Design a protein around this ligand. Sequence first.
Ligand SMILES: [Cl-]
Ligand SMILES: [Cl-]
Ligand SMILES: [Mg+2]
Ligand SMILES: [Mg+2]
Ligand SMILES: [Mg+2]
Ligand SMILES: [Mg+2]
Ligand SMILES: [Mg+2]
Ligand SMILES: [Mg+2]
Ligand SMILES: [Mg+2]
Ligand SMILES: [Mg+2]
Ligand SMILES: [Mg+2]
Ligand code: NA
Ligand code: NA
Ligand code: NA
Ligand code: NA
Ligand code: NA
Ligand code: NA
Lengths: 156, 95, 186, 140, 154
Amino acid sequence: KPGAMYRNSSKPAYTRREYISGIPGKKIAQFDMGNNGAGPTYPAQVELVVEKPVQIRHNALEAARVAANRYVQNSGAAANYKFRIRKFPFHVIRENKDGMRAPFGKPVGTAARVHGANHIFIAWVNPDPNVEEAWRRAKMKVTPTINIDSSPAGNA
Amino acid sequence: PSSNGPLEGTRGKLKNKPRDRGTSPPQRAVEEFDDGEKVHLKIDPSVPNGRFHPRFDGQTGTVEGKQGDAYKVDIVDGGKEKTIIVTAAHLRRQE
Amino acid sequence: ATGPRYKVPMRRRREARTDYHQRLRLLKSGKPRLVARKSNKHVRAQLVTLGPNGDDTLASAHSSDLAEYGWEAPTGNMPSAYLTGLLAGLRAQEAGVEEAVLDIGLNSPTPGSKVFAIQEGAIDAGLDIPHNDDVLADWQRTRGAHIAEYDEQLEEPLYSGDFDAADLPEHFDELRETLLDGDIEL
Amino acid sequence: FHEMREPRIEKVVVHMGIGHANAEDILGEITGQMPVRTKAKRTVGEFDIREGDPIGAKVTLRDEMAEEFLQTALPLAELATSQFDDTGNFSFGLDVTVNLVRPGYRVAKRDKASRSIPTKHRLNPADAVAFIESTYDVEV
Amino acid sequence: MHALVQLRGEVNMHTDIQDTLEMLNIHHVNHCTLVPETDAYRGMVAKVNDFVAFGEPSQETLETVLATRAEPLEGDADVDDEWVAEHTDYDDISGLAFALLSEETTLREQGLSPTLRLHPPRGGHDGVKHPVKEGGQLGKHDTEGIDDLLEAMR
RNA sequence: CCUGUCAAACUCCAAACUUACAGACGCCGUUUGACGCGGGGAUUCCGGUGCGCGGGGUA
RNA sequence: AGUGCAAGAGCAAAAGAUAGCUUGACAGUGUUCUUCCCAACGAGGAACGCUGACGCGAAAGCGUGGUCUAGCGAACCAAUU
RNA sequence: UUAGGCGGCCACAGCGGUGGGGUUGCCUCCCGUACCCAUCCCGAACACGGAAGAUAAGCCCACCAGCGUUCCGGGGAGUACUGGAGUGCGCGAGCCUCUGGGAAACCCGGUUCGCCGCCACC
Ligand SMILES: [Cl-]
Ligand SMILES: [Cl-]
Ligand SMILES: [Mg+2]
Ligand SMILES: [Mg+2]
Ligand SMILES: [Mg+2]
Ligand SMILES: [Mg+2]
Ligand SMILES: [Mg+2]
Ligand SMILES: [Mg+2]
Ligand SMILES: [Mg+2]
Ligand SMILES: [Mg+2]
Ligand SMILES: [Mg+2]
Ligand code: NA
Ligand code: NA
Ligand code: NA
Ligand code: NA
Ligand code: NA
Ligand code: NA
């Protein structure tokens, strides 16, 4: 199903699992990538900033993350960098799959609400921004237009 | 409303903030008012008795006599005149 | 104490001095309270009214200022209590006080107790108080007879020096007698 | 300072936690005063489902009644250390517990203006061993 | 003391807003009234802020408008110096004007209609879709700003 | 200890705002009688749209 | 924690627990709120009185069933006091 | 208030900790069971009777801010949100301007280790 159906944040927040059952598991494999044994002790820190509040289905998160980290293997399986996707798909999403009668939908998935300007991804690298490229591919699989922002890095 | 009992939608107004929790001070439950005095109506979550219908929380009426220990306060609901039976525990002097 | 949500009892409840549930019931009468309190050595009686910023004591009597009238005996006993009650009751009457309800604070409603003796005294002073006669001591014990007889089992003075060796419930009468007419501060 | 800081025995509780009694009799003679029933709480598999139900007795002894008892109880015990309370108490044995504390304890047991005893004025395990050990026996 | 001029009509304007203008004696577009600068009056003009033009006028301007558009509580009578002198506490328009500006009296108190029924602005105003800071004609004005409007509606 | 996130049916907090009563100004009423009381006669109980706030629904 | 049962709320020298005692889960009749915001409408419900008779308590006092909001039924007819 | 009793507000008063104080006004701990009364067992408690001793508890007095709380300065922030208005912008979601209001977290520095009433009293 298309993102057109769930990308807007027009519905109430719907996250209380105590009143919602049958919620599909998340497809996001990991949130901490790279050298998670080490702490952000890197010279450069780039972030992928979403430019519009939107809802991102766990579907897009997984494809976006994979496409970025799977690529960050321009550095190697045990390369020196750490990748972090800071958002989690809390918002439960429904579908009315009778016509408009008793239409309250049934749980079909989850998504994460991101507000314009928040960073969804944060990578930590030594002067070796292959990460900038890992993100051109990441914001390629999420709804919004995005800003690739670099923070600690006056090594231009 | 999914139901129409007196306490429908009273979760907030009939609940104490955690610190005001517990038996209330007796001083205000024994306060004496005179006919003509203006009193603010506000149920004390901690005091079970002498209450009035939650819809009147916030009203400011006029004491006009009493019944037993309870007071008879006159208020105006919208445009209708009504008499409320309420104890001191739930009343406060205006001004 | 632990956090923002923590509930700290009212000060007088912390101090374990005021029973607020009993207090409310007491204040219901709308009458002044006859506050009967004890100490290891003394017995106090106050007639308290309600006030805007706290209680108002309109009349009181302490077992110590009992000597001020000729008391030469200990002050932590039955005869002492009664008299202190009568004394406070009289001052009460002078103050224009006619009725009161007995507040025994955290003490126990034990029959023949000193608080009830205090109550008996205040009543005899003229104060109208809701009471129950067969919960009070039998006059003799109030007089201090139980102690005189206790000294009969002497062999050694019950009173270290003090006054008398065989004690005096008679000293009691002399005093009550005194309080019942004229004299200052009454 | 001292005299009002030196330990003393406040009650010795001798109780027989049976599971359903005839045992009181021996407690009465071993101590010298009537035993008290021991009701239990909660329903459980040891065919002990009954809430209110006699399941043992106890006896709280005070003053001489407590000494005159310990003057034979202690001798029948060896243990010491580790087996002591953090408040200076200890239980050995049929159980025999000894509650120890200092002079101003009534402050926490009375009705009016009661108050909890300050940690400083509390009795430590050590200050306890001393008192007792200094009374017909040895520690550890 | 501020000069109030309604520049936007009643159709579609909140009722509680319209009643306010009415309590300020303005019942038509281009009608003006003078209002003391008090807390009570300030709140009223703030509520009406989007359908009106207001500001403190200069002595002169007030005089021109008073002369040109002032009326008796009843009737056609022109409010000129003589009228002012033979009917008010002051001796001439200037005197009245000054008193109004120094909020010492009011048009009613001196037997005058509380409303100055102005003329459409000669040359047109700056528009009723934007405030002054945006080039429009709504909201608080400069003394020079109010004067221009008032004078164009003289 | 450090570190990454949330809530229509969470709240240590907390607006704008809505609201009871009172005073003040305004406006209104005392020949245009207000506020209110009593009585006669209805029509009406398919509504719609814009804007703000919504709940449902891919729409 | 517990407080019979949804959910939310109330409660600690208690509204919870234990013990003991007691039958106010009483008769009669009202005021008021609710049912039905505003704003008319019955049954039902509640709050708060009074009259009478009682229970407990030293006493103030508490008890108009269960801490509060669900657990209810017209006329005609029958039986019953 | 050289120590008390009844309270009002009910943490600015809580939690924790330091120092000081009593031939006496005193309060306590304390000593003790013939009585009134009392423990489903214990004068522990409750109740009664009393001073040999003590200031170690409590309590009163002086003080400490580490935790919790109250209020304030500066920063966050005139940010977030928002009542009124717009032929302002944007495919749209939504945003912006004018006008009237205006926060929370958190950080840094102060405050807070109760205040007040009646009575009694070297
Ligand atoms: Cl009501
Ligand atoms: Cl006492
Ligand atoms: Mg709500
Ligand atoms: Mg005219
Ligand atoms: Mg032209
Ligand atoms: Mg134009
Ligand atoms: Mg609302
Ligand atoms: Mg009830
Ligand atoms: Mg039929
Ligand atoms: Mg039948
Ligand atoms: Mg000391
Ligand atoms: Na169907
Ligand atoms: Na995109
Ligand atoms: Na309370
Ligand atoms: Na009814
Ligand atoms: Na038994
Ligand atoms: Na001391």
